[PDB]
Design a protein around this nucleic acid. Sequence first.
DNA 1: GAGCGTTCAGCGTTCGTTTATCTCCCCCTGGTATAATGGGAGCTGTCACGGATGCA
Length: 73
Amino acid sequence: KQIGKVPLLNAEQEVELAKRIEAGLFAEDKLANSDKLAPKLKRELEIIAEDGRRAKNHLLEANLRLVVSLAKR
DNA sequence: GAGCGTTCAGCGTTCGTTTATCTCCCCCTGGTATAATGGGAGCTGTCACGGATGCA
């Protein structure tokens, strides 16, 4: 029941989700570096870093149905 | 003294010791790239008693 209705992903959708993972990955990478970046831009990178987190959880919750299928076996 | 008689002696002389090196399989971890996307499943009937808990 908890899985509920979450959108199953067609080809173009899930590839686009993967884009935002590495987009968010490069964002937090530069933020992880010690050199100074502008504060307003830093929040924009944080937006990309937050979106990368959102895109990760979106992908997992959609694919939760798959893992239960293989668990039956 | 002759000739050999007992018995410490400390000294070698390597053999005694325990102690130090050094080479190897179980055991644990990580990784596979067509696509695959919400369970089976086992029940059920004793009997009375009471008090909580729901609902007209």
